[PDB]
Design a protein around this nucleic acid. Structure first.
Lengths: 393, 77, 203, 67, 80
RNA sequence: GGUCUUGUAGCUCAGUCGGUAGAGCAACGGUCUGAAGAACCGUGUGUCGGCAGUUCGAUUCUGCCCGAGACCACCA
RNA sequence: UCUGAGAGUUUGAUCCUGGCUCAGGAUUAACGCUGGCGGCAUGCCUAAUACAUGCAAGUCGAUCGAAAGUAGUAAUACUUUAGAGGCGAACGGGUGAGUAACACGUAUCCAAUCUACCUUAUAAUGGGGGAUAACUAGUUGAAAGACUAGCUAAUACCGCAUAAGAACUUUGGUUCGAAUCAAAGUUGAAAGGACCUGCAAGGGUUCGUUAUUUGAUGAGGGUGCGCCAUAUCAGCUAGUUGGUGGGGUAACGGCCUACCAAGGCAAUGACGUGUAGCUAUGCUGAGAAGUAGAAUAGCCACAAUGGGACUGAGACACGGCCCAUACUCCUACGGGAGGCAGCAGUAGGGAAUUUUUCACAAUGAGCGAAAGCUUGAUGGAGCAAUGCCGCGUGAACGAUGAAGGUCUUUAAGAUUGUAAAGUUCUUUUAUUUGGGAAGAAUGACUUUAGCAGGUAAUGGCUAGAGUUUGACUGUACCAUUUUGAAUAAGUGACGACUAACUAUGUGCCAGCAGUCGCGGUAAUACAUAGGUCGCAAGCGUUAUCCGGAUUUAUUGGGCGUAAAGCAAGCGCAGGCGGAUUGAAAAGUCUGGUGUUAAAGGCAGCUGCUUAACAGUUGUAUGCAUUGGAAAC
């Protein structure tokens, strides 16, 4: 038995956000240890988050790492979102595969571009119900500044599209929780209950056949190439056909084995964060930013036209215009793809304001459909955000 | 692997002990017949050879061959 | 390929006819030379005994509506039996299920008979048959179907039957019996059997 | 794939083999080239034997233009 | 069974007790077609008695076959 | 999967912390041969892979990707 | 019974010899293109490269002690086995690197041998003893494990009486070194269990165990025969060759040992070299014969490498042991653990080849009083058009000829072309409903009916019953099942060999090509278009097999000038060779016998609906041998 997974609770995907060097690892370990007491299948994930060079040697986060833990009421799949600007492309991937958002921002080091960019990205991806937990509250003289951090996060939520009223601002410390002090562990219990007070479970539908998006692929000895991802629509059993969309024309293949972080499944419903080994497939044919689907509704294109809510320079966007050769990298749901902005007739520039449906051609075709939110970043700062509303092809 | 190998080895320890004891006792009897030739000692050798022939210790022809080559020199008298 | 996709053109070019000669004698000032945009004035590139041998093979196998593989495998099968192989083989060429129905005169094209037989609409000895390559036997009962009595082409050709002595049938119940072997006069005379049969030595 | 080195011809229009680009060989006898009696796969994995050779596109490697 | 896949055809198997299936047969005593029985089952039964007298006891599936051909009706008679 | 490097004429490469785009082959008009080639007088092409700071000046500073190149992934 | 194709290619041009290429099929196939489907077959030959994870050999509580749980106050009863006992584990699976000689096969000898379980007839089931596993208490160790002190069983082990018959010899008997008898001496057997009957004694049936022994079987050995290339490889061999004594062997045996001799093979090719599993078989041709040794079967070796040996009837033991070698794993750095050329599977190389699939249902096998258990064997499934076959990519009617395109390039026509539309029909398949096979016309279960040597009955022979054994099965198949012409074709060539022609472009630049050879500005050869031809659900390419290649000339060449007659001769071996009489049969031919596995090659028949496919029937050359023929 490949440590068969058991599920009886509504599955949701939670994830920590903020700027790295604030102690993301210790907070992840603290919350995992806190929920270990509330139920099994939860271990201290502090050094289990690192798999890359300098990710453990320094004590920072670079990629989006996933852990899992159940409870008597709800199952959670935690995802770690890193800072280290120019690595935001990693954390939005976690935004691709998370349901609840936990903000981790330091108090004495109050909001920097990192935090505002993370909240703006969470807004433009299409994930609601942000949850803010104040960290490093063990610092002395935090009477007049804790309220200041609460006010600043409440106001910053509104500055990009969220609200600062529906979600209470939890506060406490994680390093003391890492040590095991009962009071801060109780504060982490309170944060978890606040999470349970929002972020409803995803809807379960079977009418739409099947769709999943890969996070990463890796070789497994004796098995072959194994990809990760999360099911969006429909169910999936062991031994069914799949179609591969992205960066290449559609490629038909067959699955071999379904696991959930090396925990095997038996009936993979929609919404489960899992991974699959396929039948006779090459690792250079399926990569990160690809899609598995079922025939009946899919069509890849590179050039498409959609509306864009451009972010003003006051909102952190570009302060100057550009030409038809301007080439940002869009981040569709799970895909990081560069596309030029080949503006159609009567359109030659996108300044702050003037929300006009722009046409863009990408280097790699994507599974596209009206309503697919995506963002536009170039130069180091995000410059726009939009959703698919028109299909030329 | 097969779990019925340690059992085989442990049975074989006692089996080998008994068989080596019997063979070296037969060897001692052969030495006794070498240093003196008579009737009763050769009868004891016969008895021991048939004790060995009781089990599969000795082939059906080995005992016959050795006792025939012994009576070859016995017939000197 | 099973079905050529056209029948008139092959007969137009090879100088034969699917029927005796009524297929092409007048079609509104029809042509008589070999078709093609340049077969009007120039007619030959390499014509000899070998070329005419291939031509006769084509006029045979396209007339019988069987793929070349089937001709080769029938040649291999007739190699199994003795005697004058060419005569017996040519006799069996019209002995096929759809060929037998064609000789009964239930349809003016072997393609139509093939469709009828493979659709399971023909009844052979309390067993539905849909493979038009079954070996026959002197003295076999054959019938298509009573339900198919309402097919307009069958009703139209019921009275305009084909008189071939080697097979006997009645169109009241659409039932007959394969009794005796055929002969030369009952078979088309526009194809030379000898060239066709001696060309198969490679297999 | 071994230390042996063989000469070969570049059939088709143009030469796109570029000094440590992988190659596949083929047989066949010729008389035009003194010292060379081999051809190279033109139209597969690097080139295309352009196209429109509706008469021969399996040889002269080219996928059938679908319209 | 040996023959076309998904078409059973198993002839009699009465060989020395230390011989693999469809190896070098000791003898051929008729044949059997499990696909269609009832006048497709037959044994020679001539040297069958001798073969029984020299080892190679009948297996489980052939006791009925020996009773079918009357061998069992003369098996115990011959032993006495 | 990320860590670095590279992109300049039709081609191959030089392009000081900007001040020209520089050489070789191809290369065009001639000199020459019966002709092809060798040799000679010379043509010239160069949006610098794509965007904003910045150097008055972006091809010599950067960030971002784009095309390509190699570099290692974890440990019972 | 049977069956043989050719063409082009030298040259101003002809003939002869002679060379070259093409025209056929075929593969353990490969690349590329096209892509419907059913069945069948097939799917690492290359790095015997190492391998994640799981599995392929277990089994028997009626063989036994003992323990645990359950019903039970308890007795006892049921369930289970950590172990001892025994059986299998030495079959079964895969791979061909090593292996070039009993490697292989065939026939005999196996007077030079063995063979437990199974077969024929048959002897016993006596009596004692001692340990010792499980267990108890620990000692060293993150771990393999190792070490001790005490307590118990058995069909375990050990003796002892005893023992038809068996074995060794002593004397005699038969006999051509074998076979049996008579007398003498000597030798060695254990184990009962289960059930039934009987109040006990005791008795009965069955199981194995001993004492055998008639057979088959399995294993092993020698010999005749020939079974890769190798004369730009002539000496080799010192247990080597032979004799003597002794020992092992399943045996004979320098197999080995102590002694004594110097022999043995060879120009009819030894020694040595490279290559390789072999055979049946498969492929090729009419044929003799040539090719490879797919899969499938037998023989042979193998288990990363090299050795050694315990066991037992069966080993140097595919998933026993030890040692060393090499890697891997960890290592408080004390030290050990593993060996997929088994089903699969990863990586790597390779142009190249499928699942970490299902059931162990059929079969076989192992174990077992018995129910039963197991078998990655076995039977299936899926992927791959990888190969063969079938079947679709509709059908009748319908033209002074829809339209367009192309040619003609231009007062017009031809071509596409029944091709199109249109008229009409219907459904292998397309899309699905319901019913729904067999393979359980196998064996075992239970009382039974009858029956046998035995009766109180078990164990057994013949017939009767079912819940029992269905993944394949939405299979096959059937019923207008619903809809439904709807679900579907490309490919190479068009100068000749080699089936098919015209046109536009570039203009010896570019490109084709197997060859002749194409193009120096109208290319029946290039790039392109139209049309056509030929193949086809496959099509062309390379790689390589035989035909042609009679191109090593048994069949089927010779040597005056095309290639060869040594420069000439004498002459050994060897080969062939006057006639007659007689012999035999060494060769030869013929009749009987064994063998030449089956499948296949040949045909017939049957079951596949048919073809393919499977089964059945008769089915060769060859050796040994019996009885003859005596022309050669």
């Amino acid at each position: 038995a490949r440590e068969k997974f058991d599920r009886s609770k509504p599955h949701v995907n939670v994830g920590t956000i903020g700027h790295i060097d604030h102690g993301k690892t210790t907070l992840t370990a603290a919350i995992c240890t806190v929920l270990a007491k509330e139920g099994k299948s939860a271990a201290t994930r502090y050094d289990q988050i690192d798999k890359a060079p300098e990710e453990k040697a320094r004590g920072i986060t670079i990629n989006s790492a996933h852990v899992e833990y159940s409870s008597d009421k709800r199952h959670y799949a935690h995802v770690d979102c890193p800072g280290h600007a120019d690595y935001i492309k990693n954390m939005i991937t976690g935004a691709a595969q998370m349901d609840g958002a936990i903000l981790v921002v330091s108090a004495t080091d109050s909001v920097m571009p990192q935090t505002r960019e993370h909240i703006l990205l969470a807004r433009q991806v299409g994930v609601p119900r942000m949850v803010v937990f104040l960290n490093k509250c063990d610092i002395a003289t935090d009477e007049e500044v804790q309220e200041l951090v609460a006010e600043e996060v409440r106001d910053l939520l509104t500055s990009y599209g969220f609200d600062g009223k529906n979600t209470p601002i939890i506060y406490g410390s994680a390093l003391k929780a890492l040590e095991g002090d009962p009071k801060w562990e109780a504060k982490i219990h309170d944060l978890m209950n606040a999470v349970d007070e929002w972020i409803p479970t995803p809807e379960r539908e079977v009418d739409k056949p099947f769709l999943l998006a890969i996070e990463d692929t890796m070789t497994i000895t004796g098995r072959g190439t194994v990809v990760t991802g999360r099911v969006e629509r429909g169910e999936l059993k062991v031994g069914q056909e799949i179609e591969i969309v992205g960066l290449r024309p559609i490629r038909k293949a067959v699955v071999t084995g379904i696991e959930m972080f090396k925990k095997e499944l038996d009936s993979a419903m929609a919404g489960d964060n899992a991974g699959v080994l396929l039948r006779g497939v090459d690792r250079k044919e399926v990569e990160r930013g690809q899609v598995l689907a079922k025939p009946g509704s899919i069509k890849p294109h590179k050039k498409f036209k959609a509306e864009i809510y451009a972010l003003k320079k006051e909102e952190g966007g570009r302060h100057t215009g550009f030409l038809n050769g301007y080439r940002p990298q869009f981040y569709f749901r799970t895909t990081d793809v560069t596309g030029s902005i080949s503006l159609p007739e009567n359109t030659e520039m996108v300044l702050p304001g003037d929300n006009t449906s722009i046409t863009v051609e990408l280097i790699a075709p994507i599974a596209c459909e009206k309503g697919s939110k995506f963002s536009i970043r170039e130069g180091g700062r995000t410059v726009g955000a939009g959703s698919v509303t028109e299909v030329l092809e | 692997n097969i779990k019925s190998n340690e059992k085989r080895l442990r049975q074989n320890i006692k089996r080998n002990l008994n068989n080596k004891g019997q063979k070296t006792k037969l060897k001692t009897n052969v030495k006794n017949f070498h240093k003196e030739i008579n009737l009763d000692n050769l009868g004891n050798v016969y008895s021991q050879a048939d004790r060995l022939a009781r089990k599969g210790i000795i082939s059906t022809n080995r005992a016959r061959r050795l006792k025939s080559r012994n009576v070859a020199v016995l017939n000197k008298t | 390929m099973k079905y050529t996709g056209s029948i008139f053109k092959r007969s137009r070019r090879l100088g034969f006819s699917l029927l005796e000669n009524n297929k092409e004698f007048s079609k509104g000032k029809k042509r008589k030379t070999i078709p093609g945009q340049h077969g009007n004035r120039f007619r030959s590139s390499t014509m000899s005994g070998y070329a005419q041998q291939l031509q006769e093979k084509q006029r045979m196998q396209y007339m019988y509506g069987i793929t070349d593989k089937q001709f080769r495998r029938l040649f291999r099968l007739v190699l199994k039996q003795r005697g004058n192989l060419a005569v017996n083989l040519f006799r069996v060429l019209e002995s096929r299920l759809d060929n037998i129905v064609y000789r009964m005169g239930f349809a003016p094209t072997r393609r139509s008979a093939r469709q009828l037989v493979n659709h399971g609409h023909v009844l052979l000895n309390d067993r539905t048959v849909d493979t038009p390559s079954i070996i026959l036997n002197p003295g076999d009962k054959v019938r298509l179907k009573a339900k198919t009595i309402k097919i307009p082409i069958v009703k139209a050709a019921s009275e305009s039957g084909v008189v071939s002595p080697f097979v006997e049938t009645n169109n009241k119940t659409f039932e007959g019996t394969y009794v005796r072997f055929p002969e030369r006069s009952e078979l088309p005379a526009g194809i030379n059997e000898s060239y066709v049969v001696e060309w198969y030595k490679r297999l | 794939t071994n230390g042996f080195e063989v000469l070969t011809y570049i059939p088709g229009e143009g030469h796109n083999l570029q000094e440590h680009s992988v190659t596949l060989l083929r047989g066949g006898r010729v008389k035009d080239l003194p010292g060379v009696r081999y051809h190279i796969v033109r139209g597969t994995l690097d080139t295309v034997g352009v196209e429109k050779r509706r008469q021969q596109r399996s040889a002269y490697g080219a996928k059938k233009p679908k319209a | 069974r040996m023959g076309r896949v998904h078409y059973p055809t198993y002839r009699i198997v009465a060989v020395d007790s230390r011989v693999k299936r469809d190896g070098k047969y000791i003898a051929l005593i008729g044949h059997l077609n499990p696909a269609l029985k009832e006048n497709k089952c037959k044994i020679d039964e001539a040297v069958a008695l001798e073969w029984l007298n020299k080892g190679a006891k009948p297996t489980d599936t052939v006791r009925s076959l020996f009773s079918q051909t009357g061998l069992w009706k003369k098996f115990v008679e011959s032993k006495k």
